[PDB]
Amino acid sequence: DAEFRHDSGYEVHHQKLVFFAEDVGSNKGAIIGLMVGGVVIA
Amino acid sequence: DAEFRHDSGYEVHHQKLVFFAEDVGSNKGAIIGLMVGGVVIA
Amino acid sequence: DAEFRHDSGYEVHHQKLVFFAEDVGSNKGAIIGLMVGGVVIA
Amino acid sequence: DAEFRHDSGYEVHHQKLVFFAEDVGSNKGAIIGLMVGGVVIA
Secondary structure (H helix, E strand, O other), rough: OOOOOOOOOOOOOOOOOOOOOOOOOOOEEEEEEEEEEEEEEE | OOOOOOOOOOOOOOOOHHHOOOOOOOOOEEEEEEEEEEEEEO | OOOOOOOOOOEEEEEEEEEEEEEOOEEEEOOOOOOOEEEEEO | OOOOOOOOOEEEEEEEEEEEEEEEOOOOEEEEEEEEEEEEOO
């Protein structure tokens, strides 16, 4: 077989931004942090 | 009628902390603020 | 009908902003999004 | 089975703390809760 199913099942590639600016697989790594804080004064 | 249904339907008053430290209805007022921030480095 | 409405002596505050920086590396960037929402009753 | 698992070259970080102060007024207090969660893949 010589098929390269990228968008299999459903076409998810809507933003060709990654094609426009190219890609290197991973930008060294990946860092994500979520900060949640609530203040209650009463 | 002279009934004072406080916990009507379901008894929600489980914490008598408000009875222990008493209450003044409202502590001048009420202030609530939620801060949400996310960081993505990649 | 307005059952959960004694009055309107409150003020709502909301602010959201996002900041994106690509000056982290040639193939690395950082983006942060901040959303704050608050309600003051007085 | 582990389909969504290429490797485990990541580290998860999580911290939560709450601070309560009643020295705002005789009948007024302020409490703040902070929760931060982050994941680094490298």
